[PDB]
Each structure stands twice: as structure tokens, then as C-alpha cells.
Design a protein around this ligand. Sequence first.
Ligand SMILES: Nc1ncnc2c1ncn2[C@@H]1O[C@H](COP(=O)(O)OP(=O)(O)OP(=O)(O)O)[C@@H](O)[C@H]1O
Ligand SMILES: Nc1ncnc2c1ncn2[C@@H]1O[C@H](COP(=O)(O)OP(=O)(O)O)[C@@H](O)[C@H]1O
Ligand SMILES: Nc1ncnc2c1ncn2[C@@H]1O[C@H](COP(=O)(O)OP(=O)(O)O)[C@@H](O)[C@H]1O
Ligand SMILES: [Mg+2]
Ligand SMILES: [Mg+2]
Lengths: 495, 90, 464, 467
Amino acid sequence: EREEIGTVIDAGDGIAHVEGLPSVMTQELLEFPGGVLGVALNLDEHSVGAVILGEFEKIEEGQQVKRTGEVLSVPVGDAFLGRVVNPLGQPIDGQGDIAAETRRALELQAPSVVQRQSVSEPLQTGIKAIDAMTPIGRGQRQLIIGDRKTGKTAVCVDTILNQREAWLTGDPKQQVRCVYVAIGQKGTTIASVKRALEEGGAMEYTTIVAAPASDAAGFKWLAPYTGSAIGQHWMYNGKHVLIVFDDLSKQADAYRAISLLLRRPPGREAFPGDVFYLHSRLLERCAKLSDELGGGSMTGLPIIETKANDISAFIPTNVISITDGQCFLESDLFNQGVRPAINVGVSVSRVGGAAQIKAMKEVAGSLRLDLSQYRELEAFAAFASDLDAASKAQLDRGARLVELLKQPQYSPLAVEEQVVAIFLGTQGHLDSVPVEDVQRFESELLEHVKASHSDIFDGIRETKKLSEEAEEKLVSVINEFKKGFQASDGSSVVV
Amino acid sequence: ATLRELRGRIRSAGSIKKITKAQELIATSRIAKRGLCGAYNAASRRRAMKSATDNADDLIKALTLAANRERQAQITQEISEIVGGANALA
Amino acid sequence: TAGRVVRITGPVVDVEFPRGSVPELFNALHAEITFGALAKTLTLEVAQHLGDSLVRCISMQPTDGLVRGVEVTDTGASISVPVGDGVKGHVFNALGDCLDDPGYGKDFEHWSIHRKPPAFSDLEPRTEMLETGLKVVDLLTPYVRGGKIALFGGAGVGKTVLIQEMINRIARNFGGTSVFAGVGERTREGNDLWVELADANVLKDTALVFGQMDEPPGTRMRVALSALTMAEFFRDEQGQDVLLFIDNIFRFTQAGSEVSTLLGRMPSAVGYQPTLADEMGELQERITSTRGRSITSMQAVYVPADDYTDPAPATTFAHLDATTELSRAVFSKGIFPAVDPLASSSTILDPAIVGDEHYRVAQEVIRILQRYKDLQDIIAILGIDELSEEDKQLVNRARRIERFLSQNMMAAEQFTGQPGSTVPLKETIEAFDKLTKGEFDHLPEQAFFLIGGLDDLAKKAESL
Amino acid sequence: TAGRVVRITGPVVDVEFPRGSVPELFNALHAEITFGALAKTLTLEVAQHLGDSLVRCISMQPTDGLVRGVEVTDTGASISVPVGDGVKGHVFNALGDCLDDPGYGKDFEHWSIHRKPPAFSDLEPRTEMLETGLKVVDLLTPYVRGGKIALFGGAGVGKTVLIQEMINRIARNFGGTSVFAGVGERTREGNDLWVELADANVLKDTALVFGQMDEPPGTRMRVALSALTMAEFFRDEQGQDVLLFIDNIFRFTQAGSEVSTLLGRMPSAVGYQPTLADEMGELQERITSTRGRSITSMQAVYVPADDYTDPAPATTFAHLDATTELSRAVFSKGIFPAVDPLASSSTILDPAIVGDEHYRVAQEVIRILQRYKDLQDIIAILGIDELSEEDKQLVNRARRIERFLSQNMMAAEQFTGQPGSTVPLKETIEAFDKLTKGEFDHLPEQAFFLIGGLDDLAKKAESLGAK
Ligand SMILES: Nc1ncnc2c1ncn2[C@@H]1O[C@H](COP(=O)(O)OP(=O)(O)OP(=O)(O)O)[C@@H](O)[C@H]1O
Ligand SMILES: Nc1ncnc2c1ncn2[C@@H]1O[C@H](COP(=O)(O)OP(=O)(O)O)[C@@H](O)[C@H]1O
Ligand SMILES: Nc1ncnc2c1ncn2[C@@H]1O[C@H](COP(=O)(O)OP(=O)(O)O)[C@@H](O)[C@H]1O
Ligand SMILES: [Mg+2]
Ligand SMILES: [Mg+2]
């Protein structure tokens, strides 16, 4: 069809230099023989430097390269829910075609500073530590940062699973569509994540964009943008989207690899001068749109893996600067049994109380100061008799609250359950409960309330407030259940 | 390994400081009402633990300064190696 | 005479011009991306002359969709921003484009963003104090007119309210105006600030210039200069005092580092650009007092790894005249503004500058508050009973002094209906002298919360 | 249509071919060294197309004696190795030549050593415990049958001894095929393993592929691929359970870093090649079980300078189902295996898979050891007596626990003179449950050092005057 053509003049470790294609665009998709795809990144007078997106071993000097006349773009639509695709939108789950509603360019600009509104709706993760201490709102970017094996993926997966009740409501204003972007992960790790999501019925409303460790560096570089484009399609159609990037460290590594292979100047840690731009361009597309644009939103949960907990490393520093708040996970807390291992002392949500419902805002008001005072007093644990009454009470309350914030994996809690649990903690109803029993106590109480006193949960959920009558009923229920509860040491927990 | 050792020392000094400050406050309380008493054998525990807490604070400060010098120096050396390789390949 | 794109490497664009039409360094060039989805007009800024009629430029927008050989037009000038009273109440990007009203201000006078500081002889040889009317700032950490104030503190400490307060006070007390420079501004937070200033009805008093986080490093590098250019017009041409807010100055330094790396320059210590000090000096030396008018700047400063010896904070603090630290502890006590009186500092709190009486009263306040901080741990763990009687007297006096550092702020009228106060410096000095001497220890503690001078103190004491 | 050597720099050779005869990437080419002392046939692997009909290649053997302008022949294919049941019981090099019986396997089916990993839809997560009989492994880093296991550690902390221990406990009674890949490790160790396997009669079921640390970087880069190709044949063609041992996989990465700048690549952070994660990903993702086809793989991962933040081990961590991390600190205390219980991990250590009791006991052990680590600096400065009573009790318990995690291993008898032991998982769980409750607090801590189960503990205690 009278196509503009060039020729491969050299090729090596996933990069091809192609002479010709004078009218090629920056970032334009290129076709190499055998259905091989590349991306034009370096354009100069002599040739075009192109990142090969796969099957680089097929490339040879002298091969004919065609231009597509199109920058990177991906199909988008409702059909991607429940599917696993690669960064080009192609299914990799072996489940047939995906009917695409339309196509989105990967580099469409973020919503402008006048196309937004303030983040004001909770994005409930179901994790008490996060939903109370560092709440996340719809449109927020909350970084999940920590060393390896600190539970970052677990928190993200729990959030996605927590969206299931919202999905079942059927109301697009409550529904949350989930995108999970796996970058550089082992394929069976992605399979395990998908299995966990399937068990909790989350694949109904979840899409997985996968760029496993065996994928070309171009795919790892592009996967977050693909997930973002899929999510943006929904965001601009009035839907609410939660996108997890697991993890952006791997994407930065892939982009650095590409840049070095393209002989672009390196800076600190050998990253190119636009790695911050890489991540900030990605993460500013997570937004809360104004009502003029449909009021949709996309919430970003980027994951960053630190090494030896050095949050001053280059990429953690960048992503911390970019995001609206940080959940710092720590392996020392994890080994102490504090699971999820969030360091509440350094974790922050700049959206804060605007992202909480009123009931949570109330019951969780004193949590931060109580925990800080507990951390200050922990040195005096063994001298509790020598402590004055106020400090002793603060120590005991802090221990109980720390037990309260503990949560088993794969079990997110509804916001009403979280409110009741934190109410137990912060109203002094755990004071008579032994520390080692708190967890069990809480769970049992929540069971009891759900079995015979559902009206409390119904009131909280429908009104988003804890009424005075509801609070009194809850208190009487707590005291009765306390009569019923058997502490592991045999002591009554009554009064 | 220099920076790792310095960070380990910073953690150790911080823990020592916390324990000594707690002990100084406990000694304050006991005054109103072992061998960590300064030159007593050679109130006194309170003064000795206040001294130890101040010494641990000074140690933490010095170790943190050394750690930041090492952190900056490692960034500079890494960049030097990276840019030297790039230049040699120029 | 138009050039053509020859090389494209991310935001770096090489452009060839005919022999005698090469643009000057820092000239703004215009190119077109015509691909429909990404269609835009690129602004390139000439960074180097490569020889043989080539220039290397930094694109101010992403170059995706740019094609080799497309025409490049020289504007004949550097990046130029609209100036005048019309920029107040409007949001601009680093290039002078209006974001809240595209096309607005295109007909205004336009000033190049690259300007020299005042000539050496035109500088004021003597420091001056910027009386804000806020007790804590005026007494303990006086601000320098034409100086630079570092601002510290995480979210939730009243930082935005403090910024609004300074906008209010510069507008209503000095008859001046404000320019906010969001360097590496989060779009969500830029939108929040725009809406909040409109709600506070201070938007009319302030010009907002946003270089957003998701922009290439060039605009984040130049946005501070753009805001500074608007402030310079206000000071030098309209004869007004200007308050220039920069958030975050470290992001200006880091954008400079990114640009320097993109241009192939070898990094200096700790990876920063070799010209780090020169760039910071060129920015900061333009913020001064000249010919009776001044630009005063409050700058958020990020400290990498909390390492004050790091090259970025080390270079920034060479230019800082005062430091205001906002503490979550103070905020949690309801003391607004939540300025940490012990961590905050000022380089002009000296007898030679603020006078002997001011210095003495301030040092007395600092001493009392420091002793109180020392006694805090004993109070918390063993109880106030353990303290000696003199210690209890000091605790009571210090609690009253720290509550009296609180004030009812102009910007606080929109949350609490009550209006704000402006305490003259002499009144603050005498009030805190009496407080240190112990002439109000009998009055209830709550009498000192959120009031102005001594008349308010008496009124609230009687009302209790 | 043959090429000619144009440039020679160490292990990297530029070869010019006639236009239209440039060999495909990863093709194997042959060149002759005729100098009598060093005479040989170099196998070169095509790394890059430099343009102008020039290819940059990596030599598999030392290039000493190679001359510019000599003929280079394109075999038209990648390096390929023999596959089949015949490779069992024999020792090969990275090129597929049989070392113990030269010329053997020439007529076997041959498979290219470059291969795509399994398709994602064919991948099934593996959650099934592989009991070893080692207390620390079975309690805190339970291994996964058909999963990926790695031993991390600095130089000389016991990775190889533990690899041999796992060959002893797992491979000896294995009902399938074993493949051992010596990747850039000591030739003496390879000879020792060969002899030991022959002695145990495990060799008949084992294919050994060696590329030693004294070989050029190309051989150390490709030996792992050769061994993995043999293993892949056993997984996908013969359809039997496969055991794959690699010692040391880091050498692969290291070899790739040794030729990176000679291949013209700008270095990345910490001197590594920019392609570190990608090459590692190709290789590691080939090392996997697929649905119904099991490969239990065990990899020794060298941690440079004991620095676990180093990019090579940091990038390797993402590829494993279970990681036993060996520590210099533990080693120097005399605790063997020198396992760091706090840093090691396993994806099947959760109540659902291992059961509530095992999970609870493991978590309690970890909590006690973490608290002991936190208290060590205080004990060093202020002494133990300044701890609270509960902390003193915890410290005594933790010292006994950390000692009881050590074990006399079968592979260690050459070093201690003590024969090894095996502890059942149920006994391990019960013993550590008793330890965490303080049931053995009255025995001297020296009673818990380098023993097996509770009967060994009782015997050693009586030897020490306790009971
Ligand atoms: N709340 C929890 N309670 C108990 N165990 C948990 C919890 N969250 C996570 N874990 C366990 O901790 C281990 C690490 O979890 P996870 O894989 O999510 O962490 P990560 O930081 O994402 O790790 P990686 O470095 O592999 O990416 C896993 O065994 C997981 O089961
Ligand atoms: N002086 C004050 N009086 C009343 N409310 C205040 C005052 N200062 C701060 N606040 C409240 O505290 C919150 C945090 O203040 P703000 O400056 O917005 O924090 P940040 O700028 O860090 O987001 C605001 O919502 C505001 O209502
Ligand atoms: N279980 C053990 N018991 C006693 N000594 C051991 C044990 N494991 C290792 N060692 C000693 O430490 C040395 C290092 O072992 P090896 O596995 O070769 O190191 P690497 O971790 O480098 O592979 C051994 O040669 C041996 O002397
Ligand atoms: Mg993870
Ligand atoms: Mg070894």
C-alpha cells in the first residue's frame, strides 16, 4: 500500500537500529518481520533506535521494518474484566479474544488541574491499620513501600478483595473496578495472585496486566501505562477504578535498562534523567474527576520495594514525593507479629480524614496520639507499677490498640466492622480484656454482633455515623458478650 | 560494609539511649521514695544514667553524621564508576 | 529561516537552523506535533549551540509524536510570562499559559523569565524586619524583608492556613500581593489550593504558577523563574511588596539535576548538577529588597535523608534568612499557628537588628520553653507531683507563655467565625516580658488561647 | 560464505561475513586456533549484529592463539546439547561434550540451549511441602515440591554443604531424574560431587553439567542453559519428576557482567550489566514446574560481599518460592547450618498449607528470635541483669532456640567428624513448641548445639550433667 520502509542496520540485546522511516514519529510502533513489534525511542539523522517488545532473537541486520503510523495504544472496554493480558492488551490466560470497546493511546495526558475535584470518597481497603491511620480516598495515590516479604502484595490484594461487596451492590457509584499490574514478577507468582483473587470472587471486577520477569524490558516499561489506560477508559466513563502497580521498582529498572542500551546519559544509580518523569507521568493519571467529566476516579496503589529499608534511595524518594501518602511496611514489625507490618509512626495520608466516613473519623480520632504515647512509654513496660496511673493506663491501652490493628491475611473487614472494632479499642472496652486475647475477643464480638445485632452494622453502613442509640445498644451488647467471653487465662473479662 | 556497620551502630546507640533514659527517670522516681551508679562504688544512678543518655545522644549524632558522609560518598563513587564506564564506551 | 528537528531523544531535541539564523541560548522555539491523538505545540528551550548550525534544546512538553524534519520556529526571545495586575486570581503554567482560562493574558505585557538580580549598588546594605503582626513570628523568629524563610512540617499542621495567613497579611497590611510557585506541584494539590484560595477569597490577591509533577523536567526547572518574574514585575513596576511562595524548592534543584543529566553533563557530588550553587544563586539573588520595595519568599524545603549536609539543602540554606517549623505536637494542642518555638529560628534575632529589649524578651521565652520541654518527660511518666515547687511555677508560666504564642489568624475566620488580630511588635514584646516576669500566672490557662494583645487578654480573662 | 575474525579483545570476537550470510543471533560459529600448544576449535556465540555484516560474538573457550582474518564457519544453529535418558550418569560441559567418556552422546537427539519459557496459561502455583529432615528448613523455610528453592549466602557460609545435604536427603530416594549444573564453581567440588554421587549410586539417575569458574565468561553464561535444557527435556518429553540443582546461579549473572562493556553496553548500577534483570528473567522463568510436569529446583545464590542489597541477589529473590538465607553472623557464632531464621522465608509457611500448629510454632520462634536480636546490643553494653524478668527469660529461651535450630548434617561430617541426623517434621514442631514454652529452660544451652531431635537433646544433656 505504498508503505514507508526502513532497514535494520544493527541489533543487540533487545534494541534495533533501523535506517530509513524518515516520517516515523517518536514512540511510534514499528513492525519487524515475523510479526515482531518495536517502539521508536531514539530518532536521529542516521537511524531510529527501537526497543523490541519481544522475540528479539528474530531480528537481523537487513530486515525490512515498516511503520504503523500509530503511537503505542491498547484496546479498552468492559471485556477486560476477569482477564489476564500483556502490556499490549493481548490475552495471555488462554481464554480467547477480548472484545474491545475502543482504543486508548498510552500517553494521553492526565486530567488537568481544572478537570478535577477534591478527593472526598473513601476507598476502603478493609485493613484496619490503613483505613484508620492512613485512609485512602478515591482518586488518591497511596504508595505501599517496604522491604521484600513485608506484606505489600498482601495489602494490595486484600484491598481488591475488599471491593467485592461494593461490586455486588451493582451501583456504579459504589462499584470499584480493579486493575492489577504485575511487573517483572515470576509467572507462578502472578498465577498465585490470580488464584487468591478468584477465591475471593474478585476476578469479576479485576483485570490483570502481566509483564513477567521473562518479558522484554519494553513490556515491563509499558505495563503500568497499559493498566493505566485500561483504568482510564473506565475513569472517564464515570466509573471508579483502583489500580495496583506491583511494583514500580521493576518498571524503573526496565526503563533504565532500555535507556542505557540506547546510550542515553545516566545519572544517579545509572537512571536516565527522566525516570522521575516516568513515574510522575504514570501516577498523575490517577485522579478524581470533576462532575463535569462524570465524577469518575482512579486510585493508585504503587508498590515500591526498598533495600535494607533505605527510603532515601533514588526511586523510593521520587515515588514518595509523587504520591499523596505512604504506607511503610517493615520486616522488624512483621517479625514482631505486627501484621500487617505498617509503621503507623511514619505512615501518612495527606488526604486524611476527608477519605474517612464520619463514624470512622470519630472512633479513630484518638488512635494516632494513643499509639504515639504508647511508643514513647514502651521503654517503661516493666516498671508499670512505678508509673503514675495515667501513664500505666496509656501503656495498657496502647498495647491493646496494637493488638487491635493486627489483621489476618486475605480477610478484609467491612467499614462498619472496622468501626466497631476500633470502637472497642478506643472506648476502653478492651481494657478489661487481656492483651493476648484482644484479637480473638474482637473477632468473636464481631461475630456476635453480626449474628444477633445486625442493626448496629446496618445503621453504621446506611448512615455512615454511629448514632447515640446505636452506641448505647453496642455498649450493652459488648458488656453481655463480655459476661459470655472466656479469657485464655480463665479470668473473667467482666467490668 | 561501612555504611551498614554505621547503621547497626546507630540502632544500637538508639536502643541504649532509650534504656538509659528510662533508667534515669526510674531513678528520679526512686529518689523520692546493681552497678549503674557512676563513681558511687569507686541519686548517683540518676546522674550516671543522665550522663549515659547524653553520651548516647552524642554518639548517635556523630554516627549519623558519619553515615550521611558515607551515603553521599557512596552515591558519588557509584556515579564515578558509571560515568567512567560510559565515557570509556563513548 | 525556520529550523528543523534533526534528533529526538526523549525531552532533548536537536534542531538545525540555516547558517545565520541560529537562535540565541535560552530562546523559545515552537514545533508542532500533528498526530491527532497527541497533537500539540511544543515549546523547546535552546540549551546549547552544538556547532554546524545545530542547537540542543529541552522540550517543555513530552515529545511523543514528534517527527524528524518538522519545522521549528524561533520566537526571538526566551520563555516569557504575562505580567501586570491581570495575573492575580489566575493559574498559569511555567510557560505563561493560563490554565483556568486558556488564552487569558495573551495580550498582557510579557517579561522574559531570565533576568539579572538588582545591580550591586541598588541593593539595600542593611537588613530589615518584616513585621507580620503574628506574635510567635514577630517575637521569636522575625522575618527579614526581602529575605527567605524556610517552611517545614508535614500534612495536617496548618501549613496551608499559614500560607493563606501570610497572603492575607501581605495584602491587607503591606498593600502587597502574592505569587505562589508550585514547583513539582501535585495536580490534586494544585486543584485543592486553587479551590481553597477561592473559598478563602484570597485568590484575587495571589497569582498561581504551577509546574506540575507530570511535566518534563524543563518546566519544573523554569516555573520558579516564571513566578519570580511576575513578582519582580509587581515589585519593580507596580511598586508593591510581594510575597513569593515556592513549594518545593528542592524540586527546583532536582529538576535542574534531571535537566543537567539529560544534556549529558557529568554529575557533581551526590549526583547533583555541577552548577547547582550557581543555579540556586541565580534564583535566590533575585528575591531581595531594592529601591524601597521587596520580594519576601517563604519556601518549602525538602531535606534528602534528613541530611542537612546534603548538597541540595546545604546550597538552599546558604540563602535562607529564617526557619519556621510547624509541629504536629503544637497543632494537636490547638495552638495556632502551630509554630514550634524551639525548632524555629531567625538569623536577625540579634540585639543589633531587633534591639536589646526584643532580644532579651525572646531569649527569656526560649529559656522558659526549653526548661518546660526538659520537664515534660518527668511530667508525663512520673506525674507533675514529683516536680519541685519552683518547677511547678515554671511549668505554669511556660504553659501560659506557649498558649499566648497562639493567635487568632485572619485565615482562621473561615473555620472559626471570629476575626483575626494584628499585634504590634512593641505590644508583643511587653506582653511576653510581663508573661515571663509572672504577672499573669493567676489568670486561667484558656484565657491565653487564640487572642491578640493585652486588651484581648484582659477581655477574655474577664469573660472567664 | 564463511566469515573472518576482524577484532579480538579477550573473550569477545568481531567476525565479518559476506553480505547475505550474517549468522542469526545466538548462532554457534566455529573458528580454528592452530598454534600447537593451544590448538583447539573455538565455539563463538553471536551476541550482536554490529552492522556492515559484522557480528560480535562471545567465545566459549579461551581465545589465546586466535589470529585475525582466520575463517569462521556458521553452524546455522544455536549451541545445542544432547538430550534423552542417555545423559543420565554422565558428566558434560556447557557445549554438550561428555567429559567422562569423550564422544559419548554424539548421536543423541540434540536440543538448542536457547528456548522460550512455558506459556503463562500453562503455569500452576505449587503448594506442597517437601520435607527435608532439617529442623530449621522444615520449621521456618519449608521447601516446596515442584517449587523453586534458593540458598542465599556470602562466600563460604555453607551453600555448597547445604546443597550436598539436600542431594543426600532429597535426591537419594527420588523417583525421577536429577540434573546438577555446576555454574562457575570449583572444579575440585565438581570432582568431589561426581565421586560422591557414584559412591551413593545416585549418579545413574543424575546428569552432571559443569562449567567451572576457570572457564571463560561465555561458558559460565551458557552452562546453566545447557543443564536447564536437559532438565526441560526430562520435564516436557519424558514426563517424569525432575530435581534440578544449580551451584552457583549468581555466576551466570557475574559472567554476563564480565563481558558487558566489551560488548559495548554502558554499565548499570554497582557495575552490573544493564540487562541484568532481563537475562535473569529469561533463565529463571525457564526453571519452573508446569501443570502436571514437576521440576523441584534448588539454587545456590552467592551474595557478593554478604551484601543482600546487591542487585544480583536482590533481583534473584523475586524468582523463588522458598529462600534459605545463610548469614555470616550466624556462621561466625558456629551455628550450622548458618541459617538466618529472621531473614529466610517460604511461600507455603501459612496456616492453610502447613497447619495451625506448625505456623504458630514457627511464628513464636521468629518472634522470640526477633526480640533477642533487639536486645543483643543492650545485653552487650548494660549486661543481661538490667533486663526485665520476662526479657531475661526470653533471652535464655532464645539462646536455646537459636542453638537448637543448628543441626549436625550428613554432609558436614567431613568437617566435624560427627555423623549427621534427621529430624521428622512432627518431632521438630513438638520440640520447638516445648522450647518456646520454656520446658527446656533448665538445660544448659550447650546441650542444644548441633544435635538432632529430643532424644539427642536428652543424651547430650545427660552428657552435660543435666536432665
Ligand atoms: N496480614 C498478614 N498476616 C500474616 N501473614 C501475612 C500477612 N500479610 C502477608 N503475610 C505473609 O507474609 C509473606 C509476605 O507477603 P507478601 O508476599 O504479600 O509480601 P511482599 O512484600 O509483597 O513480598 P515480595 O518481596 O515477595 O514481593 C507471605 O507469606 C504472606 O502470606
Ligand atoms: N488557626 C486555625 N484555626 C482553625 N482551624 C485550623 C487552623 N489551622 C488549621 N486548621 C485546620 O487544620 C486543618 C489543616 O490545616 P492546613 O493548613 O489545611 O494543613 P495542610 O496545609 O498541611 O493541609 C485544616 O483543615 C484547618 O481547618
Ligand atoms: N553444616 C556445617 N557444619 C560444619 N561446618 C560447615 C557446615 N557447612 C559449612 N561448613 C564449613 O564452612 C565451609 C563453607 O561451606 P561451603 O558450602 O563450601 O561454602 P559456600 O556457602 O561458599 O558454598 C565448609 O567448607 C565447612 O568447612
Ligand atoms: Mg509482592
Ligand atoms: Mg560453594
